[PDB]
Amino acid sequence: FNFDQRIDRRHSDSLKWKKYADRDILPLWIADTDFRAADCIIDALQQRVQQGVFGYGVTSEALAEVAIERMESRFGWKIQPEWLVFLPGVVTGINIAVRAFTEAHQSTVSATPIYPPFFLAPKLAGRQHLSAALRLEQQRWVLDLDSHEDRMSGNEKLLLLCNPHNPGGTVYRRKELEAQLRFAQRHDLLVCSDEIHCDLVLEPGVQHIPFASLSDDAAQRSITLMSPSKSFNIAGLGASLAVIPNPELRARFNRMRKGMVPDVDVLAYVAASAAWREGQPWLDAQLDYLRANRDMLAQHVNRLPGLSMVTPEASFLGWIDASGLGVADPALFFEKHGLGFSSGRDFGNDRFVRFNFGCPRQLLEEALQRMTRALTSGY
Amino acid sequence: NFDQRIDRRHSDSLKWKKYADRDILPLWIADTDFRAADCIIDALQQRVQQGVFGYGVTSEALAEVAIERMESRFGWKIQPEWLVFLPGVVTGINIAVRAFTEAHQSTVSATPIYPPFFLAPKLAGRQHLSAALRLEQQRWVLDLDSHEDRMSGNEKLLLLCNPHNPGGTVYRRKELEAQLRFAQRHDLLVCSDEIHCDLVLEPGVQHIPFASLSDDAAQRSITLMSPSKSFNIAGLGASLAVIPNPELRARFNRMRKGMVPDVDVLAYVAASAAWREGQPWLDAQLDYLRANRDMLAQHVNRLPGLSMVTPEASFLGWIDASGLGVADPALFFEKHGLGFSSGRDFGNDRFVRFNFGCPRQLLEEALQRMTRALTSGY
Numbered sequence: 072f073n074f075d076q077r078i079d080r081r082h083s084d085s086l087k088w089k090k091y092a093d094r095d096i097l098p099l100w101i102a103d104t105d106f107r108a109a110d111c112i113i114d115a116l117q118q119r120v121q122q123g124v125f126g127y128g129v130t131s132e133a134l135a136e137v138a139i140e141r142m143e144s145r146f147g148w149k150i151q152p153e154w155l156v157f158l159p160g161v162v163t164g165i166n167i168a169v170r171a172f173t174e175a176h177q178s179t180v181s182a183t184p185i186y187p188p189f190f191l192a193p194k195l196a197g198r199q200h201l202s203a204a205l206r207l208e209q210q211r212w213v214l215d216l217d218s219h220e221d222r223m224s225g226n227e228k229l230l231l232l233c234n235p236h237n238p239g240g241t242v243y244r245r246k247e248l249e250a251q252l253r254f255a256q257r258h259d260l261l262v263c264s265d266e267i268h269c270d271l272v273l274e275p276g277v278q279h280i281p282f283a284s285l286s287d288d289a290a291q292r293s294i295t296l297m298s299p300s301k302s303f304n305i306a307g308l309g310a311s312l313a314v315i316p317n318p319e320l321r322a323r324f325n326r327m328r329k330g331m332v333p334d335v336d337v338l339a340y341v342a343a344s345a346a347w348r349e350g351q352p353w354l355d356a357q358l359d360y361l362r363a364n365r366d367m368l369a370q371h372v373n374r375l376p377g378l379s380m381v382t383p384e385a386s387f388l389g390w391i392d393a394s395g396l397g398v399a400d401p402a403l404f405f406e407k408h409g410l411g412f413s414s415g416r417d418f419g420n421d422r423f424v425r426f427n428f429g430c431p432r433q434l435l436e437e438a439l440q441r442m443t444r445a446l447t448s449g450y
Numbered sequence: 451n452f453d454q455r456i457d458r459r460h461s462d463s464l465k466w467k468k469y470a471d472r473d474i475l476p477l478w479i480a481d482t483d484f485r486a487a488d489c490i491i492d493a494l495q496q497r498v499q500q501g502v503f504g505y506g507v508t509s510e511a512l513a514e515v516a517i518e519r520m521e522s523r524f525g526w527k528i529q530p531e532w533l534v535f536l537p538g539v540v541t542g543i544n545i546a547v548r549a550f551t552e553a554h555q556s557t558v559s560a561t562p563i564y565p566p567f568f569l570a571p572k573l574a575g576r577q578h579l580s581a582a583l584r585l586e587q588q589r590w591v592l593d594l595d596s597h598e599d600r601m602s603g604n605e606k607l608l609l610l611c612n613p614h615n616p617g618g619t620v621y622r623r624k625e626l627e628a629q630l631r632f633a634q635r636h637d638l639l640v641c642s643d644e645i646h647c648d649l650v651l652e653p654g655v656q657h658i659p660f661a662s663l664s665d666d667a668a669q670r671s672i673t674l675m676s677p678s679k680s681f682n683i684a685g686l687g688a689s690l691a692v693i694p695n696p697e698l699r700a701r702f703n704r705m706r707k708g709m710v711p712d713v714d715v716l717a718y719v720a721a722s723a724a725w726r727e728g729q730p731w732l733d734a735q736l737d738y739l740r741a742n743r744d745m746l747a748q749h750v751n752r753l754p755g756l757s758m759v760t761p762e763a764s765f766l767g768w769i770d771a772s773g774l775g776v777a778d779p780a781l782f783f784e785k786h787g788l789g790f791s792s793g794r795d796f797g798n799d800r801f802v803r804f805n806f807g808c809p810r811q812l813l814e815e816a817l818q819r820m821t822r823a824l825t826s827g828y
């Protein structure tokens with residue numbers, strides 16, 4: 072059956088295994104797993120390639136159908152079909168939202184640290200950005216936007232959220248989402264919720280909650296970004312979708328997208344459909360494997376005498392506080408000890424490193440031993 | 451190689467979905483009904499069977515074969531740093547309009563033309579100067595220095611298309627150097643769309659890139675190329691833009707970041723396999739399209755109200771239907787079983803665009819529908 076302990080060689084076109092191509096450094100940085108795609112995804116792609124023709128394609132009605140069924144059955148959120156807008160990636164959906172829902176004098180609000188494109192998009196669009204620092208509470212990274220009221224200027228317009236949160240891995244609860252909703256209403260902000268990791272919730276008894284499912288007011292003021300790219304390791308194809316219930320906001324979004332952003336690949340539609348249509352047993356087995364990998368990394372990091380890490384509620388990263396080392400560059404430090412992490416400076420906190428434990432357990436054990444060898448003793 | 455194969459498409463093809471339930475032959479969108487070359491299909495399945503579809507790097511193989519293809523086929527030496535890979539060509543046109551013109555500046559192209567040539571400036575707030583094509587020696591020629599006094603002075607980007615999309619014109623040396631001097635005379639940056647360059651049908655005539663005329667041409671130009679049209683893989687859209695100028699290349703890349711994503715992982719492999727091992731398949735396609743073209747041109751000029759120039763580059767198809775006395779010639783042929791591209795989309799509603807990129811048996815069934823509709827439907 073499913074065997075996530077398989078080790079592949081790349082020796083491919085993967086950006087992950089080519090940054091440290093000819094160096095003895097373990098790639099554990101970019102947010103993709105080393106897992107072979109589900110059989111349903113590969114078999115669907117083969118049936119489409121053997122079809123022969125690759126002309127201009129239409130948007131997948133099958134993907135829109137399986138996406139609606141998934142949002143209603145797994146998250147309790149009924150989706151109207153015309154709310155969907157398919158995109159070639161999630162990063163492009165973040166940029167279009169900023170260019171379309173903000174003007175030159177208006178600003179954006181998000182958390183810090185966060186997925187780098189969240190404050191890179193206002194930077195490229197000529198928009199100033201307001202950042203609210205995440206604070207640790209009960210071994211969880213929580214967001215307190217209400218404690219940043221007086222730091223605002225009235226120019227704020229677009230609220231950029233991330234649930235589950237990259238890189239912290241926090242799965243926001245219902246009370247915390249309703250607090251972020253009340254913050255958006257009190258300041259009359261538009262919300263852009265990035266929910267790419269919604270399928271990777273590991274905590275039992277806790278369900279991912281879409282922001283636009285809280286009420287009809289949240290739905291009419293927000294845009295929801297979702298994709299099976301990270302759930303099924305098909306980011307190299309990049310089939311995603313945006314859910315905009317507001318008709319006027321959808322027209323402003325599509326007008327900003329038209330011509331500048333192309334349509335989704337013909338083969339990317341086939342993989343994204345098979346991922347959400349029949350890949351669920353594969354995704355179930357990956358969660359158990361990732362939780363076992365997560366628990367090992369979490370217990371190992373807390374024993375080392377210079378690192379702190381919150382157990383991520385959502386796989387598969389990986390936020391390690393390396394401020395206890397005292398080095399001027401924690402990411403460059405681990406690189407000279409054969410460990411290639413994502414530098415936290417790109418996320419807005421040069422004291423952290425992002426750990427990608429989305430890999431076979433044999434490779435994780437070798438990474439954990441290089442961490443033990445690096446800190447002890449001594450360096 | 452055998453292009454007379456009849457492939458059925460009730461699938462995701464945009465071509466055959468527009469008239470999926472009706473008895474109308476689809477001959478409108480600019481893709482062919484031909485099966486992709488075996489080298490492209492084998493390369494995809496080899497990449498699919500690897501299993502992992504994570505983030506990919508820029509194909510150095512596609513960059514290598516693109517540099518060699520420009521030298522062998524067109525006599526144009528490309529530096530590796532000039533290449534910028536894009537997911538599609540329409541996105542490249544929109545980036546060039548927004549990175550090389552400001553709100554108070556205008557663009558110049560021909561008319562009729564590929565619709566995104568005047569839509570992209572319209573959707574970007576730029577005014578557009580259209581230079582009409584006149585019929586000269588049974589060829590749609592472009593005369594830019596005839597509209598000199600019609601230019602305001604805000605023109606900055608010249609939008610070329612070699613070969614032409616509806617007209618199918620393949621420009622010569624004396625013609626391309628004329629529009630280069632026209633761009634030098636008015637300090638115009640050039641965006642040359644050359645996605646049909648591998649589909650030249652005239653014997654003894656080579657496609658000539660705009661930036662290959664002189665070093666000054668290369669420092670002011672943007673060349674868009676892709677195997678999407680020639681190898682029928684527009685559903686993947688692995689394109690590339692060459693920009694010899696470092697300043698214009700920085701503006702282009704800055705205008706792309708975040709908005710336009712990277713090229714698909716599978717799109718890199720298919721485009722790499724196309725230009726590396728697909729030339730025998732393309733050579734067989736050119737002979738097949740040249741025979742289909744001559745059949746259409748002979749039949750369309752024997753018909754009464756229609757006229758058409760023989761296109762120099764496949765696979766359309768620009769038929770003049772003004773001699774029919776109808777308002778919408780595309781709607782007229784639609785109710786008689788023929789789905790063409792209305793010339794109104796291109797800037798001349800009196801025309802219809804025939805897409806003869808199909809097996810010859812299907813083309814003959816489309817020509818008979820033209821006779822029955824014209825002998826005599828009125």
Ligand SMILES: *Cc1c(COP(=O)(O)O)cnc(C)c1O
Pocket residue numbers: 102159160161162163186233237265267300301306309
């Ligand atoms: C990985 C990641 C993405 C991926 O987006 P792509 O455009 O498919 O590369 C989007 N959002 C977040 C928060 C991510 O971590």
Ligand SMILES: *Cc1c(COP(=O)(O)O)cnc(C)c1O
Pocket residue numbers: 480537538539540541564611615643645676678679684687689
């Ligand atoms: C068909 C056509 C294209 C197609 O561009 P894609 O992005 O590959 O779909 C581009 N330019 C011209 C002139 C065309 O006729």
